């Protein structure tokens, strides 16, 4: 037991402390399951054009609501009082109030059956009326190109939905005149009159748009942006494909051939929420709002103050953790940039107000032009990458085990052999 032996043994038992204090650090670091992001910009010569849902901020027209419609659902759509009578009409236009009062007689009126879905599909705004000239990549478009969808805003329309077997439309050039370009007439004179401000009374005009991939359904109620009449609105989109990491690295639901949804063929963070709401309503009181899928009968207007708004508020506010919507491990989303130009120029005001027989004032306050296009033909890709894999773990453990004590797993096996041979 000399000083060389003692010093060497002490240095070994000192170098063995650092080895463990570092190996356990690496093992813990691996078991945190860290990741890092990789952003890239892939240039492409073709991008599939997104689906463009949009619809008027007016749920449904005033010239289409009828005597029958005003009876069953007059109270719901905020035109009649509780006792089937018109509320205070101090701030009421004379002609508008007379054209409503004759619709609210109910003198020996024999009500007919009422279907809320049928009401929306009839009183809602018609694309054949709003759409004045659609264009796509300079080729004339049509009102038959817009598919009818039903949302909380009523009867909305989706362009390039990719549903009903139609092929999704590709775009070949960026820039302004190489995408969708629709002139709309929001029909501001069909808007429901506002006598008194209720909780939900809305004073705005214009339409609401959402730009989404064809996989997910429209969700304009939360994901839309407004565009205003009398304004060329350029919407420069940017495709953005996102790869996420499943557990344990992240929290995402790897896409399977089928969806984990009772009402939707494919899975989406939005389809999940719509499915949750529909299932909750159907299981609670056996009816669905007009905008939900499935087969249950639509709620009658009586079942909206007794079954729809209460249950939906209950689910949203305090009961919010029934359905946890895992967000898919990859999806394409569309960023956007908005800009505006005045419509119409003094040069072409009269041409429009003659092309449509309407007044120049009307054209000024009713006509808008969406112009949705890709800025440049490339897509951003945002990936989550696993930051420390098992091969890296073995490398980092071996390279320092062989730096501090110069051992290997075979050296440990030989040491176990020797320890066994002693004990025998």
């Amino acid at each position: 037991l000399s000083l060389k032996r003692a010093l060497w043994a002490l240095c070994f038992l000192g170098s063995l402390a650092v080895l463990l204090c570092v190996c356990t650090e690496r093992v813990q670091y691996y078991f945190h399951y860290h990741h890092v992001t990789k952003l890239d910009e892939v240039a492409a010569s073709q991008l599939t054009f997104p689906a463009v849902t949009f619809c008027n901020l007016n749920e449904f027209r005033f010239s289409q609501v009828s005597k029958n419609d005003l009876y069953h659902a007059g109270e719901l759509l905020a035109l009649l009082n509780n006792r089937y009578e018109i509320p205070d009409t101090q701030m009421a236009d004379e002609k508008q109030l007379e054209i409503l009062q004759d619709k609210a007689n109910f003198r020996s009126f024999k009500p007919k059956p009422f279907n809320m879905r049928e009401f929306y599909d009839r009183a809602g705004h018609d694309i054949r009326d709003m759409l004045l000239s659609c264009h796509f990549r300079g080729e004339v478009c049509s009102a038959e190109d817009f598919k009818v969808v039903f949302t909380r805003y009523g009867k909305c329309y989706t362009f390039n939905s990719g549903r009903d077997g139609r092929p999704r439309l590709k775009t070949m050039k960026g820039g302004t005149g190489n995408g969708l370009e629709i002139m709309l007439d929001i029909q501001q004179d069909e808007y429901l009159p506002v006598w008194g401000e209720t909780d939900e009374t809305s004073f705005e005009a214009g339409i609401k748009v959402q730009i989404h991939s064809q996989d997910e359904p429209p969700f304009i109620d939360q994901l839309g942006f407004g565009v205003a009449p009398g304004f060329q609105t350029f919407v420069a989109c940017q495709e953005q494909r996102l790869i996420y990491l499943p557990p344990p690295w992240g929290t995402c639901k790897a896409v399977t051939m089928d969806s984990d949804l009772d009402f939707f063929d494919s899975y989406s963070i939005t389809a999940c929420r719509i499915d949750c709401e529909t299932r909750y309503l159907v299981e609670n009181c056996n009816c669905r709002m007009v905008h939900m899928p499935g087969d249950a009968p639509y709620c009658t207007p009586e079942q909206y103050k007794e079954c729809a708004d209460p249950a939906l508020d209950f689910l949203v506010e305090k009961d919010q953790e029934y359905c946890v919507c895992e967000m898919p491990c990859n999806l394409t989303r569309y960023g956007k940039e908005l800009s505006m130009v005045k419509i119409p120029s003094k040069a072409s005001a009269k041409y429009l107000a003659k092309k449509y027989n309407k007044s120049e004032q009307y054209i000024g306050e009713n006509i808008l032009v969406l112009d949705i296009f890709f800025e440049v033909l490339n897509y951003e890709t945002i990936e989550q990458k696993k930051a420390y894999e098992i091969a890296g773990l073995l490398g980092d453990i071996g390279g320092q085990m062989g730096l501090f004590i110069g051992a290997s797993i075979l050296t440990v096996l030989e040491l176990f052999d020797y320890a066994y041979e002693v004990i025998k």
Partner: nanobody
Amino acid sequence: QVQLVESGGGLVQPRGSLRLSCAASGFTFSRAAMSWYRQAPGKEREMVSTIGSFGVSTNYSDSVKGRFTISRDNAKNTVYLHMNSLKPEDTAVYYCNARYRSSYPWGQGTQVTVSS
């Protein structure tokens, strides 16, 4: 993968009570309506009962009304059919599958025969 195995069903005496259990794997049943079916020997599957994903709503057939009970156990992947007052008219193999999410492998099914 989607197992959806069904167990706990055996031949029973007429006017007897039996309990049928299914173990759905492969999907989050928490958000899946679950239905029971009768494969009549030589005939197509006929729905027996359906329960909502939340368990609040129960649907039955014509002959199943007020004779069967459907129970759904959450976080246990088990659907319970509380059969009662059985008759030979319901002697068939029983299949449990998601009602609205029909594109799934159908399990073997437990045969219950109400003879004696």
